[PDB]
């Protein structure tokens, strides 16, 4: 930061001095679910060499979370979401550019601790028939563990260019009833995956073996809600002034499928079976800085 | 936040420069033993393309766990909170929209942790016969631990549209007595669901065999405070400048029952017993600035 | 908060331009023991639908942890506040209401951690006569642990409504002397209820066996000091510009109590034997903007 | 806070727009061991009911850990802080009121931990002579742990009315050389109560077999700052515009007594053996807003 | 800081009563998959002895995690960034140097903990024969512990001088599915270096055998964002104002192979394999206060 | 702090009201690998009875970890910084003085643990004999654990004089992959000091047998950024306004050898083999409040 370089905090930062134009902007997707929301700030400092137009993307994507399939007692699937997806494109011929955006990848960490321990031991035993015993003992005692987070998704930055830029947040693991963590590709020889499996052989049908929302992050089911920042510069002696962007919310769903074998419950996941994809074009009308859908 | 993309500290921020219109309505809903507080601010920001409403929904459903019924010595039953709801809804026909609103999903986490060790051991014996032995050994452990909160009700943003938005407070899991935790579902075959019982066995009659309320979660007697903002967005130049809200707090109660079999008592929870709805229509006129109810 | 909505902290809150005028009651009860003090604030701001008032209760409502009975050597009392409350409450008839207040129910939360070992270990053995032996072995442990806080006291926040609000500070449970911890039901079939006993077997007068009051919870004897806010809205429309409110404070006490059985102490405690209700009245002035006693 | 009630931060603290009169007064009582300092401050904010008077009570009262008596090699003794106090009292005629203090007596809290360990293990053996043996085992763990901070001295605030209010800083317990904690009740039947005993058997003269002060609590020779904050409100109509005021500082010391059986080293608590208490009384003018002694 | 030795906070830092040139500037490559930017400020404080320009690097370099060769069923290989770097180079003749730079390297630092445990038992045995047996038994084990931090990648700061400034992130060390963490080195006689292989054993295609990106580190293949500072100085009274400045990202990919023997999946990784160097010229004009590119 | 006297933040710091004279001066040596920059700042506060000069020693050493000896296949040695060193010196005639300098020297602390654990255990036997047999036990641990932080460098100021002032950074502990601690002085008898010593047996040749510096503590390649404060008051009426000081920048390299002794490496650790010192002398102008060099 500017102080541990010996400059007064905020003195190289871009803003000050400047009416900035904001405007919040919403529309709602009824047939993909997602409640999507740009919130935007135009700000155009004298001071710095290009006018700059921060993007916040908002709103929430449903998680819809849904048993969607019944074939029968033994047989049943849920479409659960592996991942959320937000996107802002500039088109190939745009002057205006991909500055910065926020948040990003950061470093993840884990914590070792080595064990070390020897030890010495004795005996002295004895019976009522007069015998005396002993016993003289050394151990040792050496390892290890390793401690990190595991978030039940991640939020990570896709590698921008000056054109695009986007986000997903995709499922990492989940605990079932304080078992697993399982994941997209827990396989057990008996059970097969059992990420969102009720029980491992109760009697009810297939559709009411599956995991109770509420007892799963609530993103599968209730959902997400983007909160992703994105910062467009543009030259002021550029001819053309306007700017289009497309704005994608994405929602990408697993496929959950119970089958009763002749004994027990047996779950399979197919990845990326179903992509719901909600596409909105931006004006960007930096004279008059306004945005408008 | 701005200052991850090098942009002065509240610099985006709507708000600055405008004189903001605040207001509270109370109403008390005796039926249903619901305080409800609106806490409600207009701010027409110059520099912003909308008008905005913040709406804070406040006040406090009360969470009346109550042994209710009583049918003899061996039979007792008790409601109970298990789910508390705010929601506000825009009218079909409505130009504002709903665009953004606090608190929302957070993702959750957990803590894993590997564990490796090995070792070595070693015995020499002996007896006063002069009979010597020895013991060469070795092992391994490997092992993890998992780590995560569990709060006794999770506060979850229901999925909103441009028109709606809710959330609800639902029962998790409570530890009783130091027992469990335990929840809507817990079963034991001796004991059935032990969630509120005070006793396997105690000679008291049933409707004194109950978790005192004090011994758990305090949402569940005195109840639950609401704590929500909702953000609704104006154009300045729509035709109708009125507009109206609907409010329901709710309360979903379960019915948790005890009996004595002959030898001990037994649990049962059927879930969603009742639900209490109290609705508000609020008006809101964006001209004047105020709403009233 | 405001930022996590876009909007300037403090944008929202109420009161700025405001000539605030404040206010001091103190009363105490001897016959009670309780100091009771009123810190009162009135706020009119014109950008607000309301006037406002906000109470304070504070003050100190002593513990008075007492040993009150001797009937000989063998048999002794102590009086002990299980519960302190301060209440205030609105007459039927008022046309101000109760707003907002503040501590209230907050989730209490706990932390689950799983474990997981597997193991494998060998031996070889030998004697002195030549004899060689073998083990090989395996072992799984599979468990949990679970954690959380035990307040000795609960804060709790009673169900409100516009006319009423009260707090009751409750009695959880305690450690005596690294032992418990015990509550109000503990019931061991030698020693009974052992709260507040000193010793299980000490030679001393029943007087002489109760813990030290400086060895418990210091709420106990010096005793209690609320710090609860309440607020109160009121229509400049208002025909009647005066309101009365009464404010109830409260001591709950049990009865604990030690005899000897002919081989050791044994302790009974008795819930809710006397009350001690301290209660006033205050006239409020919205147009003076004085509150008096 | 005024936050949580949607109030701007600072808006119901009384003071601003007041010049405030302040003043230090120190008094030494060297019989006594004390450094007694008054700082006082004078708020008359015309916006609220009444003058107030914040008097802070600081200086230091020495603890004077000393071994004072000695009578011959196998006795001797140390006297040793049990308690500091300090006191504030208004006179029975008084119009001044007591309004408010800092610090106060806050709820302590424990965390437990539940623990639950289940096992299956098993073995094969074998020796050279081609004997087949075996072992199948299983096993259950539970239990709990508790946790709890155990400071040396706490702090209490006594019982106050609108005419007195008091500190107590007690000694609760103490570790010493690793061994204990050891209270003014500790009891071993062969080393009697082990508080300050530097040995158990060395063959020192008793008057050094004492804990070094340095490895003691340093509130226990060097000694105890208070720095206790109380609030005196007057009303402004009131007749009489001078108070009186006393402050106490006082000392309460235990006795605690080495001698020589035959054999080892054996340690008496004597509770409360000398008080020294240093009393004064200040004048309040409230109308020069003047503390004088 | 300035507080450490009785300064004002911020007294001592460069930059008040200046107005700030700031600029941003946006490159690129697409070759190389590097979102390049520059943001940069001008700081000519007149009480400062030298004008000052800030370069912050930030942008993002792709990850690029490839699995690129297939060579049939049982060999396959991936290309994953081993590290990140970024440079900045003034040419030998510049009068104008590198001054600071920011984040810089700091010191590691670990947790030890010694271990120490002391036991005694004893056993009493006996049967229906009438016979009795006894042990005694004493134990001790000494030891320790030791903790620490390994992060996913380090970010180092390379050894600078007047005309150059770099930092190069690098891959430290990795967990996979639970396992390692494993290292550019990991070596295992049978399974090689196991660090991105899937399974041991699976009968899938060497291609699908490699660890999903989504399980490791998002910098491998999202990527990672610079956000380094540099601080360049310059005399007012040089001869030439103007400057270059040479900027290079670099991504290093090593060379992670997989393997059938008969038997079991078998990894190698080669250090380096690939650069990919992206470099760029930036103009500093120290009278217009402008840097282009 | 001020506000631990009842003094308003801040009252007590010099420099309100004063314009600061700023500068940077930057040195890099070439043979010595030591980037060198003294940032300064005179503080002429009128209110202060002296001139300040507040001399921030800053740049970087590089660590310079480095094979430097190949004497064949079987011994090569590696030269790295045990210690980093800066010192300022102002000569004999001088009347300037050292006043004040940051960071200093601090407590170090270390969490002391005690356990104790009593035990009670019985079993009953039996065999298809129809023999039973039986077993009680008991038995205690009683031990302790301590905790503390092992920094890799030390950073230490040294004595300082009203004339000099430096610190040195000195080389304390490293692991070295996952094993160790190791330090200067480690030994054991068949592997030596195995502080840099990256496998016990390879065959590679002895210069490829260090330890990778990536693995190492990154000061002992990339190095060390000092960021030390120096404050020199200077009287106004001294005769003479112009003070000379000389700066050292310093490392003191270890000798770290290995060699094949016929079966294993084997390491050998000297002390302090070079060092390399670069001196710079500063010419400080109070009267125009300028630092050359």
Do not use: C, H
């Given at each position: 930061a500017d102080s541990d370089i010996n400059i007064k905090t905020g003195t190289t930062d871009i803003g000050s001095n400047t009416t900035v134009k904001t405007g919040d902007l919403v529309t709602y997707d009824k047939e993909n679910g997602m409640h999507k929301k740009v919130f935007y700030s135009f700000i155009d400092?004298?001071?710095h060499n290009k006018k700059l137009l921060v993007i916040r993307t908002k709103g929430t994507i449903a998680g819809q979370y849904r048993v969607y399939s019944?074939?029968?007692?033994?047989?049943?699937?849920?479409?659960?979401?592996?991942?959320?997806?937000?996107?802002?494109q500039l088109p190939d011929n745009e002057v205006a550019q991909i500055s910065d955006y926020y948040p990003r990848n950061s470093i993840d960490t884990k914590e070792y601790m080595s064990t070390l321990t020897?030890?010495?031991?004795?005996?002295?035993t004895g019976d009522d028939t007069g015998?005396?015993?002993?016993?003289i003992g050394a151990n040792v005692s050496i390892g290890h563990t390793l401690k990190y987070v595991q978030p039940d998704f991640k939020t990570i930055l896709e590698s921008p260019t000056d054109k695009k830029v986007g986000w997903k947040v995709i499922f990492n693991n989940m605990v079932n009833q304080n078992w697993g963590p399982y994941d997209r590709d827990s396989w057990n020889?008996?059970?097969?995956?059992?990420?969102?499996?009720?029980?491992?052989?109760g009697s009810m049908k297939a559709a009411d073996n599956f995991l109770d929302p509420n007892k799963a992050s609530s993103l599968l089911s209730s959902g997400f809600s983007p909160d992703f920042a994105t910062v467009i510069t543009m030259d002021r002696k550029a001819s053309k002034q306007q700017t289009n962007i497309d704005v994608i919310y994405e929602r990408v769903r697993d496929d959950y499928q119970l089958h009763w074998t002749s004994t027990n419950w047996k779950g399979t996941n197919t990845?990326?079976?179903w992509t719901d994809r909600s596409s909105e074009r931006y004006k960007i009308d930096w004279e008059k800085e306004e945005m408008t859908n």
């Open positions: 400092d004298k001071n019944e074939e029968g007692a033994n047989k049943s699937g849920l479409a659960w979401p592996s991942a959320f997806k937000v996107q802002l020897y030890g010495f031991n004795g005996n002295v015998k005396i015993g002993g016993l020889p008996v059970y097969g995956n059992q990420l969102f499996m009720k029980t491992r052989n990845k990326d079976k």
